[PDB]
């Protein structure tokens, strides 16, 4: 049996640039204002959730540095022309920031002319807004911290763009990519703040420092080698053993 044990936490800030809405009262527009009320009902549910103030300690620390003034201005300006930026915070730590969605552009570019409409334009908006309806729906029930990191918290195409830029080894990027659903089950999404037209939540990916070492099951527990010593449930999959630091049916 091989191995894939966790040693640290990879912290990162995921942002979804929102857009301010002004006065909008003015058949095809019947469905526009209905998906518009869901966007209003979703952004207010995030702010009311924010009103309330030890496994993910390294991740939540960033969520309390974002509350500082001007820090949002650092991130909102970093993701000006692209969707991936690294910023040295007040603590001097450089965190990686990725702008997943750009609702700030889609609303001021396509809805200012009509409101202030083709039926084709209404279709795509319901999908871009539905993700916010779901991210809010998930953050509202798990009380700010969701796990595993779902598709809405970070899609399949966006978790890979993060693992590729992850300052880790080369083959482990090949390991985590083939076992993305396991990486998600060992991750944490942490809702942070809502202000200055930015929706940011801290995503915490697992760091696997121990790979391809012998391990054996069955004292009801697992045993994995680790620097000449052996440690102690672990999510197993095929020949790979995934675990972290604290009926042998079918046959193959």
């Amino acid at each position, epitope marked *: 049996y091989l191995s894939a044990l966790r040693t640290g936490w990879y912290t990162s800030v995921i942002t979804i640039e929102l857009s301010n809405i002004k006065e909008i009262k003015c058949a095809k527009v019947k469905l526009i204002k209905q998906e518009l009320d869901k966007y209003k009902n979703a952004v207010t549910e995030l702010q009311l959730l924010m009103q309330s103030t030890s496994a993910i300690a390294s991740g939540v620390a960033v969520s309390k540095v974002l509350h500082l003034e001007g820090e949002v201005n650092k991130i909102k300006s970093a993701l000006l022309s692209t969707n*991936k930026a690294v910023v040295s915070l007040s603590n001097g730590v450089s965190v990686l920031t990725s702008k997943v969605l750009d609702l700030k552009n889609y609303i001021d570019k396509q809805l200012l002319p009509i409101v202030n409409p083709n039926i084709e334009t209404v279709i795509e908006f319901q999908q871009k807004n539905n993700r916010l309806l779901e991210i809010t729906r998930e953050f509202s029930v798990n009380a700010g911290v969701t796990t595993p990191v779902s598709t809405y918290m970070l899609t*399949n*195409s*966006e978790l*890979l*763009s993060l*693992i*590729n*830029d992850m300052p880790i080894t*080369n*083959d482990q*990027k*090949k390991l985590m*990519s*083939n076992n993305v659903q396991i990486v998600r089950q060992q991750s944490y999404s942490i809702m942070s703040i809502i202000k200055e037209e930015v929706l940011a939540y801290v995503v915490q990916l697992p760091l696997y420092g121990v*790979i*391809d070492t012998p391990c054996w099951k069955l004292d009801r527990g697992w045993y994995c080698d680790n620097a000449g010593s052996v440690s102690f449930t672990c999510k197993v999959q095929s020949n790979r053993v995934f675990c972290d630091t604290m009926i042998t049916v079918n046959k193959q």
Partner: antibody
Amino acid sequence: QVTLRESGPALVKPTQTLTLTCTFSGFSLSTAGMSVGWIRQPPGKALEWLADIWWDDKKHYNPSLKDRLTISKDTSKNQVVLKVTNMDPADTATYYCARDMIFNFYFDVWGQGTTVTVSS
Amino acid sequence: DIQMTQSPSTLSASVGDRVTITCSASSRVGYMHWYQQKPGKAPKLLIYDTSKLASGVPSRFSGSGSGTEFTLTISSLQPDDFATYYCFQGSGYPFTFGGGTKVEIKR
């Protein structure tokens, strides 16, 4: 299926820039995990990796050719452009491009390959 | 970096003879791959991930190995196997290939 084909000048005048373009179909580079690499082979010698690009515009070059290599993608055209400045009598090689995925670090699908000979 | 040493450099055997290529690396490498290049043609992926076999290739080819040593074993040689085989690593940058084993048929 996946297809690749190189395109460029077969004869180079020494030190003149060499623009090589690899068009691909059957897959979109914009899809996450996708990549496109470049491999050359001088006559009589073995293969040699050159560079590669990824969907997130992350670039990795070979330290053997540090200054001259410059790669760039083009999702809107399903092609990858590679510029090699200052060509030299030793750079005669059969240049190939290939697709790469983060799920498996190698080049599975290949192209026919173009011959570029470096001579006045 | 990671340098490759492929042996033998040139081997000759008859049709149906077991042939194994040994390709060692400098540092510890997780996965090893193999390629086949017919004369003039572009290479073709034979063995991927040390032991697994790629599609479009008969089960005649097999590989094994881990760490700093890897082998590619041909069960029974065939006249259509005349080519130059390489061992490629994708565990670290820069990407490096093997030395180059050119196999000839015994006739």
